[PDB]
């Protein structure tokens, strides 16, 4: 029984970050930590798979902690290599029972942290495309995921309030493509991405290709 902070992390330039683990328990716990890599993320083809600790892109020190009652610990996470493009991982935190100080079906809650292994120069580049069935397709040409908040299928070239604001809220990861589920005859499209602090807002528009 414990809690971790935080549950999502970005890692750039080879610098480590820490995930902290806090016990809510009166009994001493034993915690093991393991990393899975996320393949074809953002897609319907997204799955997880176990990787090793130093050659898979993530360095996790340590992977086993004795966590005394009410104690807290730090786990270090750093990238092995700096990738050419964004890779994404999940780091699991699990109470292992050597012992943790009808029947019993003990409940083991597990937390996993989403880790973004980021490239040196974050570059965002989007492509436009038309499907078979001529749905409109967005492709990620950049080395970093593209968080799409809202897409503007403008009738005109410019953003009149007649255009159809369709919300997608989806991350399009590099080398991958995304279906707008729109085949209609829009002239130009406008895409809105996410920001809060520091990382620099931009806005972008891409011409439709005909059906």
């Amino acid at each position: 029984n414990f809690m971790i902070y935080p549950i999502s992390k970005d890692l750039k330039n080879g610098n480590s970050e820490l995930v902290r683990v806090y016990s809510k328990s009166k009994e001493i716990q034993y915690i093991k930590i393991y990393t899975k890599k996320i393949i074809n993320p953002g897609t319907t083809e997204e799955y997880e798979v176990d990787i090793p600790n130093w050659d898979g892109g993530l360095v996790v020190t340590p992977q086993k902690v004795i966590l005394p009652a009410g104690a807290s610990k730090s786990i270090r996470l750093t990238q092995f290599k700096i990738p050419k493009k964004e890779e994404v991982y999940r780091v699991y935190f699990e109470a292992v029972k050597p012992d943790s100080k009808t029947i019993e079906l003990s409940v083991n809650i597990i937390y996993a942290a989403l880790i973004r292994s980021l490239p040196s120069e974050q570059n965002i580049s989007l492509n436009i495309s038309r499907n078979a069935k001529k749905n409109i397709i967005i492709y990620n040409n950049g080395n970093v995921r593209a968080g799409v908040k809202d897409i503007y299928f403008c009738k005109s070239s410019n953003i009149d309030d007649n255009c159809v604001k369709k919300a997608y809220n989806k991350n399009i990861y590099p080398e991958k493509s995304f279906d707008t589920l729109v085949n209609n005859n829009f002239s130009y499209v406008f895409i809105k991405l996410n920001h809060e602090g520091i990382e620099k807002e931009q806005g972008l528009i891409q011409l439709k290709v005909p059906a």
Binding site: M3, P6, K9, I38, T102, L105, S106, V107, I110, A112
Partner: protein
């Protein structure tokens, strides 16, 4: 104030504000051919933008019996009105919910219904130990 870089947390608690337990036993009773449900309401403690929390479990849980693994009796686990599959279930905040606290992450007040099941419907029960575990996994999505 000054960042305070990271902004995402998850902590699952009872809606009491109290902790979940390690082990749980359903009372074993016929009740006109039924098995009672270990309901527990929940809190989910998270910072704003929490809402994209996903929940999938490590493996399909089993009543586990070494000496006899012969027969297994199903277990169905409901959260937010949805069953819980080894397949990740995208959730929205599911707090109901939305409030703001610059000092606090505001709760998500509803019930987890672990409702153990039978292999065939309307079923006469077998006899045995049925030990076991249920791993539960909280994360965010890509």
């Amino acid at each position: 104030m000054v960042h305070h870089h990271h902004h995402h947390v998850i902590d699952l608690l009872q809606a009491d504000g109290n902790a979940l337990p390690s082990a749980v036993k359903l009372a074993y009773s016929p009740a006109s051919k039924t098995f009672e449900s270990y309901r527990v309401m929940t809190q989910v403690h998270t910072n704003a933008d929490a809402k994209k929390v996903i929940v999938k479990l490590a493996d399909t849980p089993q009543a586990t019996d070494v000496l006899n693994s012969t027969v297994q009796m199903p277990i169905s686990v409901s959260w937010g009105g949805q069953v819980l599959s080894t397949t990740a279930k995208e959730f929205e905040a599911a707090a109901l919910g939305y409030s703001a606290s610059g000092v606090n992450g505001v709760s998500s007040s509803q019930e987890l219904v672990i409702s153990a099941a039978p292999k065939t419907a309307g079923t006469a029960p077998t006899a045995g130990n049925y030990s076991g575990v249920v791993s539960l996994v909280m994360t965010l999505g890509s």
